């Protein structure tokens, strides 16, 4: 009973006849009898440790453990499984009595290790914490709709409301401006929408307000050629409901425009052709006047419609004249404001002085950058104002003050041909893991403190800080792009030259890949915990340059109600990096003022066969999600949560005997002679409060015999 590094999965159960010299002879679960390398052969945890709902009690805590245990438990059609603080579900798709009414009011206690693995339990325990500590709680959903999750919190929220349906109604519409098909695992809502439900001191639901975080603002332009833009763009594309297109003056052809033509616009798997009816219907019944209703279309179209703008290089000079008056004019009518002053404010923006003379200066390249910047900003702020309106139709006036918030975030991203966008998203995803590590460290710190003997290494967060500094800390990586766009003559290669000069060897996490087999050549690589990342920095200088031109902003006030309403409410040339860092700090602050808990989602396979595992995928998601990193934390450390009585009970094979279940050396009579049976290292375990943590792994062999 051992584990073998088989070719396909490298973490599957094995069967050793024996092992010799460096080459293990073994009959594998994956296939037939084979010979394999010793060093990566791992050892199976004992039956008493084996098949435990928590993945924190398995002596050889290594990755194979959590792999096979998930494989078996889901093989037996179990879906709820505990993995340290993390909770893991697979949510099969052929109906099972999963939402049975018996459990709905059932798990009203049983903090986390007193009931069968189940997350409604932990959410209800969060309810109890609310009752006791009167302090906010946060749901940490990993994985996106691309991970098959959508059907979980839609039920969990109703569960929490049990001890109302307006919450979902936002989803169908806000998806259209937020779902974006990617290279891998398509059709993912890439925008973060923290969702909170407010309770007063009483506990009856008063309201639930929703605020989005860290929307992907650079998806609007320079999308990858392989991928596709926001769903709404192709919703408007399809001729269905052509009257709104008649309002919007669009020709109904994707490839006409610059922004769209980067996209594929032909995704046979899912198009909004049918969905446009549902999105329009929700977008109406959510309390929208027809004027705002069609105005939303007006702005969304105009954001496309700039894509037709074309400029020429002036003679013997530098600034840009406008070409293509008619499309500028159609846009101008579409937003109402005059065309002539718009093109002029493009060609000669105003910059103030101690008294604001009409200062002037531009270049064609700057203009092509800036107009896109303006489009991106106006779209993002439009989206957030729609969030405000969704709050408006859901407004309340009760005393609501204490909320338990569910946040959905983009999942960890590792695949082919990853530019800036991936770096941003990955940084965001991993900061939350930094938050998790520090949190679990705090709680285990006080708990082990009650049993105080000695802590291994304070602040589990250092493991991530080692790369957090590299990504963000001044003159790190992200800072270099900020500096490089500013510096004159932005050239792509000079960027990487500077990076290699500044953080190679000097930074122990910045290295270079070699011959990435078929995927196009990445330039530089980083060693994250979850996966070494590879990027090519082409187009980065273009991506992050975005000058928020003022004159047009001030020009925007004298038009339709929406645009003035959006842009009236609200500098070192803000570039996506800085805005992004600041907003992420805002988010972590909001989580800094809360308490976490963890709900995960697992995809079985692309073939969508419920009830049956498929190893190629799940291993990647589990490694990416960082549950393996939490298991790494437990494995290298004390965290193996063990009753001292439990250890005295299980250890009777070295206290010569066979009979388990008590009635031999108990808690008070141990750590005296026991390790002297087979000479196990001392001080790896004691009893402070008769709760003992372990350097586990040494406890697997001793119970096999």
């Amino acid at each position: 009973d051992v584990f073998v590094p088989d070719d396909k999965e490298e973490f599957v159960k094995a069967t050793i006849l024996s092992r010799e010299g460096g080459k293990v002879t073994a009959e594998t679960e994956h296939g037939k009898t084979v010979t394999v390398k010793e060093d990566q052969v791992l050892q199976q945890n004992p039956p008493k440790f084996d098949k435990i709902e928590d993945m924190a009690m398995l002596t050889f805590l290594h990755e194979p453990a959590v792999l096979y245990n998930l494989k078996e438990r889901y093989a037996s059609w179990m879906i709820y499984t505990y993995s340290g603080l993390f909770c893991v579900t697979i949510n099969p798709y052929k109906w099972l009595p999963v939402y049975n009414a018996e459990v709905v009011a059932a798990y009203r206690g049983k903090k986390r290790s007193e009931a069968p693995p189940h997350i409604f339990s932990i959410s209800d325990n969060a309810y109890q914490y609310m009752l006791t500590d009167r302090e906010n709680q946060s749901i940490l959903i990993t994985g996106e709709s691309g991970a098959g999750k959508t059907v979980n919190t839609k039920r969990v929220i109703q569960y929490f409301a049990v001890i109302e349906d307006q919450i979902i109604q936002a989803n169908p519409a806000l998806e259209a401006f937020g779902n974006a098909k990617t290279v891998r695992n398509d059709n993912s809502s890439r925008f973060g929408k923290f969702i909170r439900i407010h309770f007063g001191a009483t506990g009856k639901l008063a309201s639930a307000d929703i605020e989005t975080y860290l929307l992907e603002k650079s998806r609007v332009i320079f999308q990858l050629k392989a991928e596709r833009d926001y769903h709404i763009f192709y919703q408007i594309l399809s001729n269905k409901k052509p009257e709104l297109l008649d309002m919007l003056l669009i020709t109904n052809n994707p490839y006409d425009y610059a922004f769209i033509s980067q996209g594929e616009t032909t995704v046979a798997s899912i198009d909004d052709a049918e969905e446009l009816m549902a999105t329009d219907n929700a977008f109406d019944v959510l309390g929208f006047t027809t004027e705002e209703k069609n105005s939303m279309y007006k702005l969304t179209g105009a954001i496309m419609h700039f894509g037709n703008m074309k400029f020429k290089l002036k003679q013997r000079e530098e600034q840009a004249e406008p070409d293509g008056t008619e499309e500028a004019d159609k846009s101008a009518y579409l937003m109402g404001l005059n065309s002539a002053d718009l093109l002029k404010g493009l060609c000669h923006p105003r910059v103030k002085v101690g008294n604001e003379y009409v200062t002037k200066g531009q270049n064609v390249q700057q203009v092509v950058y800036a107009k896109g910047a303006l489009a991106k900003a106006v779209y993002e702020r439009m989206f957030n104002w729609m969030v405000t309106r969704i709050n408006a139709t859901l407004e309340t006036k009760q005393p609501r003050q204490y909320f338990i918030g569910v946040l959905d975030i983009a999942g960890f991203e590792i695949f082919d041909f990853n530019s800036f966008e991936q770096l941003c998203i990955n940084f965001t995803n991993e900061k939350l893991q930094q938050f998790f590590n520090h949190h679990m460290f705090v709680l285990e710190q006080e708990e082990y403190k009650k049993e105080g003997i000695e802590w291994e290494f304070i602040d589990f967060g250092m493991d991530l800080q080692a790369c957090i500094d590299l990504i963000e800390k001044p003159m790190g990586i992200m800072s270099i792009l900020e500096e490089e766009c500013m510096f004159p003559k932005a050239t792509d290669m000079t960027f990487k030259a500077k990076l290699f000069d500044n953080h190679l060897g000097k930074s122990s996490n910045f290295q270079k890949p070699r011959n990435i087999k078929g995927k196009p050549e990445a330039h530089f690589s980083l060693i994250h915990y979850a996966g070494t990342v590879d990027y090519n920095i082409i187009g980065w200088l273009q991506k992050n340059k975005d000058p928020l031109n003022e004159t047009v902003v001030d020009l925007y006030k004298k038009s339709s109600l929406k645009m003035l309403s959006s842009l009236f409410a609200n500098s070192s040339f803000q570039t996506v990096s800085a805005l992004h860092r600041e907003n992420l700090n805002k988010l972590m602050t909001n989580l800094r003022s809360t308490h976490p808990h963890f709900v995960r989602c697992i995809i079985p396979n692309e073939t969508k066969s419920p009830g049956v595992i498929d190893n190629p995928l799940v291993m990647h998601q589990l490694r990416c999600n960082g549950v393996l990193e939490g298991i790494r934390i437990c494995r290298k450390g004390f965290p193996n949560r063990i009753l001292y009585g439990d250890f005295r009970q299980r250890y009777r094979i070295l206290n010569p005997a066979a009979i388990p279940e008590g009635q031999f050396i108990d808690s008070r009579k141990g750590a005296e002679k026991l390790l002297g049976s087979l000479d196990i290292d001392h001080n790896q375990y004691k009893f402070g409060h008769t709760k003992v943590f372990f350097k586990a792994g040494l406890l697997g062999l001793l119970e096999e015999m």
Binding site: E483, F487, T494, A497, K498, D501
Partner: protein, 369 residues
């Protein structure tokens, strides 16, 4: 497919075994900045190599690390090796046998340490330096004759009969290609122009590249261009000026045919090659006169073939046929032959694998070549 990379001082040319054309060729300049850095954040490169360095000579000083077939200031020539392997040809040496090139006899210590430097750091699998002329011979498919490559750093002759490299008549000469440029500096000072610095000194070889044709009966052509203004030619620097070169046009290359101008007291190349002819048997002269092959660079000057034919037929007894082989594949014949030699399967056994070097010590190159 091993590799072939020329050493010659002028243009380090890189390519692949078997291929008929060097994959990348670039001037061997090495550059350093000669002024302080003023616009903070440039991320200055501490040294530059090849055509990248040639691009911005404006603020650069130029060191040629290769003079007279001797590799000096080894640090920068190693820099050139490193730039070649990774940036131009773009493969790690770890998986490619490598062959180099070397003038006839330059010093003893040169190869004996160059093999070490290129064989210990670059960790190449195997290498074998081959003397220039015999390689030039294969390049043209003639296995009998005299080679006059005159690669920019050094000029030399070998007699090779029936594929035997008859040593003792090897007649080296340091009338290098660069020194024609350097003399042209002094001759161009007279027409009133001035080219003091190093960058302009690099330009002038370019201006030499087009406007130097060697002419028969030097005295008569000289008086001819003196009396008549027929050939008064023009050209422009990347400055805006236009420069008018008179008889210096055909007084440049004739320093080759007589060195009295440059000063060196060693006869012109035609007399040296005739000398090396007359220092062999009385039966090899029958064929040697017939297969005379130019090679290397610095002989793309128009006419030089014909002028050479005239001088030799005047010197040799007027009963032999001196028809000299000057293909226009010159300036690369070194490299073509090198690739062909690397392509020979029987040649595979020759060169030196790492085992021999490690177990024998550095002298293995001299002992086994």
């Amino acid at each position: 497919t091993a590799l072939v990379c020329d050493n010659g001082s002028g243009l380090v040319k890189a390519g692949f075994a078997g291929d008929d054309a060097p994959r990348a060729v670039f001037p061997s300049i090495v550059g350093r900045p000669r002024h302080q850095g003023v616009m903070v954040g440039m991320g200055q490169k501490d040294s530059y190599v090849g055509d990248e360095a040639q691009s911005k000579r404006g603020i650069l000083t130029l060191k040629y690390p290769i003079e007279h077939g001797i590799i000096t200031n080894w640090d920068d020539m190693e820099k050139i090796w490193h730039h070649t392997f990774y940036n131009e040809l773009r493969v790690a040496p770890e998986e490619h046998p490598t062959l180099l090139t070397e003038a006839p006899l330059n010093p003893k210590a040169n190869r004996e340490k160059m093999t070490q430097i290129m064989f210990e750091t670059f960790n190449v699998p195997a290498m074998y330096v081959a003397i220039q002329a015999v390689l030039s011979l294969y390049a043209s498919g003639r296995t009998t004759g005299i080679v006059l490559d005159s690669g920019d750093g050094v000029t030399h002759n070998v007699p090779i009969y029936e594929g035997y490299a008859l040593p003792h008549a090897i007649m080296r000469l340091d009338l290098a290609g660069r020194d024609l440029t350097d003399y042209l500096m002094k001759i161009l000072t007279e027409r009133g122009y001035s080219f003091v610095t190093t960058a302009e000194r690099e330009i002038v070889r370019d201006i030499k590249e087009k406007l130097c044709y060697v002419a028969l009966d030097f005295e008569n052509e000289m008086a001819t261009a003196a009396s008549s203004s027929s050939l008064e030619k023009s050209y422009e620097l990347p400055d805006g000026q236009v420069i008018t070169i008179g008889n210096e046009r055909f007084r440049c290359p004739e320093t080759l045919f007589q060195p009295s101008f440059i000063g060196m007291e060693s006869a012109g190349i035609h007399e040296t090659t005739y000398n090396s002819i007359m220092k062999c048997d009385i039966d090899i002269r029958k064929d040697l006169y017939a297969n005379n092959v130019m090679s290397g660079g610095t002989t793309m000057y128009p006419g030089i073939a014909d002028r050479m034919q005239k001088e030799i037929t005047a010197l040799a007894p007027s009963t032999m046929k001196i028809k000299i082989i000057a293909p226009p594949e010159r300036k690369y014949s070194v490299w073509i032959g090198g690739s062909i030699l690397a392509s020979l399967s029987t040649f595979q056994q020759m060169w030196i694998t790492k085992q021999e070097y490690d177990e024998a010590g550095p002298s293995i190159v001299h002992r086994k070549c």
